[model samples]
Target: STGSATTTPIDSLDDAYITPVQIGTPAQTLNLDFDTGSSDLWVFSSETTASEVDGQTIYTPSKSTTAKLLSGATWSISYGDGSSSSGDVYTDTVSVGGLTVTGQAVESAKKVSSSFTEDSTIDGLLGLAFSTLNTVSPTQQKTFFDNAKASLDSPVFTADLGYHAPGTYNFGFIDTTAYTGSITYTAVSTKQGFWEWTSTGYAVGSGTFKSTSIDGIADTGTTLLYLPATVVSAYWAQVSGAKSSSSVGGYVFPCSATLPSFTFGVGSARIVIPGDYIDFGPISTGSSSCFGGIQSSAGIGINIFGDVALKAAFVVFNGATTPTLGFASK
Candidate 1:
């Protein structure tokens, strides 16, 4: 039978969002970032050193009768920010919303970097990318969605990320009520284990649409939208008093500057990111400088359509012979 689960993402520190999920036989809840950039359902656990853990909850396999240690297997992962974790593996029952997946490979963290230990808001990450990207050793592991997809009424999932507000991630099916207007669809090539797509071009506010296409990934885990350096520079130039600041390590502008909306072309659909949304926030308390939510993806291989861009529209991650991205205005 096909089943679906709707989860509301909790808007946490800065803009990273997390969804609550259950792990183990009795279902121990953990707030996990639904990361599309990587594939590994890992979590902080009892195995993690007590000295390394902070206020975050840890998953204890010993407490779950269904949890089984996977001997001789281990895994480790790193994030773009230098945060890393290494751990043993276990098979446990994992559930999201009301749907359940039994014997899912749950990576248990025993050693975590300062970033992972200090972030009390997030327990771990639930990678929604392709299973081929899994970091398990000996043999790769399957994601929760992969384990449960056989029974899903539909293989698709939708991301409805909101700004400073709760949004939904619906698995197995798309919720029509979450979006408006007819959805514009674009084909995605997942050859790189990411939901990568190409934009026809982009426009700054009402200015001309450039004819430069950019290839990028739609990542829910990432907080800011990143484009090619050329594109990022062009957008920043339009903002008065905006410049690349070394202290802030990105573009910053006077908070009072008149920032314009940004638009990216996906087929004939133009997804406009509100101007205020690009005004990420003030660099510091009582400071006149504000960070630019859009930054350069110079070193990051491809562009990343982070929350700043994705939230402007409803995104659908289709699971088909050739997956496609369906966008609709919210």
Candidate 2:
């Protein structure tokens, strides 16, 4: 059943892509992107004065008869990519997939960057990650999950990262049509809002990585899978004709032959990343290229299994039940 669906990349890792949900009678549709890296629902508004705020669709309360602003304190956000936006706080009726959530805390950015101004697809990000990174602060905080959790058909939220379409991110109740086994649960680390974990090692074809036990973290924010040098080198060695290339940050590889199938072992669960994701280069500087999926993160503090690895698994975020993440079949 899972074979029918394809996978894709989730555009803009900033967590700004949200579903367009209409709220109240004569419902008005609002665009939203759910983000797990941070806990805050922010939107662009006509009040924002930044030059980068040009093309983003701003929610105009005057046009919506049912929408109301919270009239809370003003807020602003600065991202790692040197982009920033600010606006007055507001609470209004919000909905996703026909589910209405009342008194939702929203940030109306009075200022935004150029990157947001250019994208006409969506309006704002609905942070669905976890409670730890909430921007609302303890005194006046509210999360999209906090409100929608009650309305969900199930206590869990499932992410189906379809391969064919990269931005095909969906929410709400988990679709049981994809997988064919029991879901395995793992407790979330006590870190701030980051979902960190340890990896036991990797298995290629039928061969498991020797001395495969090591600590690792799974991050949706990152784009690539970062492996330790030990794992990266070991994996590269297995590819018969594959040779490492320095072009494209030395992570990409070129090979005339088919590479081996690789699977990551997390606790008792096995996550397989197809080899097509690994063979990544034309090698401008060298005669041959290196694999993309297995890269060398020699000095990087932690090994992160970013979107590349996550796309292969049916990931469930279970913050509602407890600090936990579960892996199931796709």
Candidate 3:
């Protein structure tokens, strides 16, 4: 009725969170990046070219007796940064944590971009976004969560992403022990196929909470927190020796600079992000200049509450007919 899995940051930067998933009949285990921004469960596979397959694990549909090819079905995905992948489809048994889905669509990559090949840490991505965003053609497929929700004890899941430690993703029921105090619930807009919500306002350090409505999406797939240029500038302005550097790209500050904290509103609750989390790693090995974990979302069209923001609190993704999001202090 319920299931849970441990998620770990891939590296010291907490670039992305990786969770173990089992696919196929004999259960080929692989470390998958759970992305809430996209809606396609794809993986490196036997169908992929040898050149594209570096040290990453690949899923072999041929080895699974339950694997059924979705004839004439194909899929392709392109990210904002220009990275892309294209593949065919297969429906097979897939399991995450202790939850199992009998016929889950698994997209097998036949071609992948250089960016994906560079990162050998993640074998694939398990999309938790709405099914409407699925890239599969001819017949769109539901995500692992979408397919498993009805069978779960409750149609909801929680994301407890950690800063540099291990976190847990719980399905069916919310674990009360995972968070403290009560959760503040907010409505979400699934129109864009994302868990998009509006923040009441934000404040830099101990400044006043400006009552400005900012629309953003909670994307675990994204690594940094992206807000309006005004908000980002306001936060960095308080940090000594901080500047918008084009060389390193985005905002960069002195590694030794005493950074200020960031706070944002979710309903009536004010979640504060510790300053230490905003001090991203150095631009290069032993470099004095460090990149910021929070950046401007001017050209991005939409603000993004990525891992940097998500790790600050506990989040609930309710998959009921009328979807909603709940935020809590950890």
Candidate 4:
């Protein structure tokens, strides 16, 4: 069986994408952020502190007849920004699109950082990365995709993020019509539990393609494309009046600047990100300077191919014995 769902951008800048998920017996729907960079299907729940709860919906496990305590199981995940969420575990019926999985471990948040409490757009996060990255202890839990793969016609999923628009997340089968040309395949290293892969090289604007290997992860959870400092600097140099600013938190340029397109190689295939997408958004409300969608990953440790990069193509996360990634221009 195959299942498909719509992923909608939460804000104008495409800061994050969210998909509706149904949890528990009677089905309490919650809009969740599908993060391919992390592996923990956690949510705001009745256990969450009222102070941490804003406009976000909370999952009430007690309301679900099928909800079963995981018996002393707990989970805790921290973010780079010093934010975190930790909670107890419960096994319940969960469904994404039309794909259903029984006894799916659902982490109920007991404490959430201020950032999560401030952003009420997402109720929780559904991790799509390898289950090995799951934070649940005593016994790590499988992700929604991992559990559902067995029932799917194909043990694969695809992400087609749009530019300030709704996209599609398809499970089990690829939608051939969703992309143009043939997909370029590359080996994926799930060693770190991410869809980590290497790009052949990159080109800034119409600059000559540099023959080099750039390692990065295809992360839907991340909002920007973070590359090595050298690569990021080269791309920004092409944009007139662009500068890395401390106050702005990244490279910012005049909003009216005639930006150049960015191209990265996937094997022999070249996927180009339009200049408009790179413009990102204004540094501040009504500000003339705009933050760039592409930034340096110097401090990030690993380069990340986030939504800014993924939006340019259709990405397939193939879960074969030897995991691989497929990219195709659309």
Cα lDDT for residue 84, candidate 3: 87
lDDT of 4 by residue, 148-252 (tens): 888889889999999989999999999999999999999999988999999999999989999899999999999999999999999999988999998878899
lDDT tens per residue, model 2, 1-330: 010112233253322223565543455565665555556788876566757565556776656566566655766666544666667776677766545677777677777777767766657776665655666532455676767776666656555554434433334555666565867777777475555666666876668555466565555544567787767777777766544555446554445757666788766877777766554444444655544666666656667766667767877777555657777756
TM-scores of the candidates are 0.95, 0.75, 0.98, 0.98
What TM-score would candidate 2 get against the native?
A: 0.75
- Ten-residue region with minimum lDDT total, candidate 3: 78-87
Candidate 2 lowest-lDDT run of ten: 1-10
At residue 243, what lDDT does model 2 achieve? 48
Task: After superposing candidate 2 on the true structure, give the runs of residues whose Cα lies further than 4 Å from its correct spot.
Answer: 1-18, 23-31, 80-83, 118-122, 137-140, 166-172, 204-207, 210-218, 233-250, 254-261, 278-303
Q: Provide the clashing-pair count of each candidate structure.
A: 0, 32, 0, 0
Better structure of 1 and 4 per lDDT: 4
* Residue pairs with clashing backbones, model 4: none
Question: After best superposition, candidate 1 residue 291: deviation in angstroms?
Answer: 1.1
Candidate 1 on 66-128: residue-level lDDT in tens? 999999889999887678898999999888877888899999999999977777878999998
**Local accuracy by lDDT, each model:** 0.85, 0.61, 0.93, 0.94
Worst 10 residues of 4 by lDDT: 74-83
How does candidate 4 score on lDDT? 0.94
Of the two candidates 2 and 3, the one with more favorable lDDT, higher being better, is 3
Best by lDDT: 4
- State the displacement of the C-alpha of residue 25, model 3, in Å, after optimal TM-score superposition: 0.9
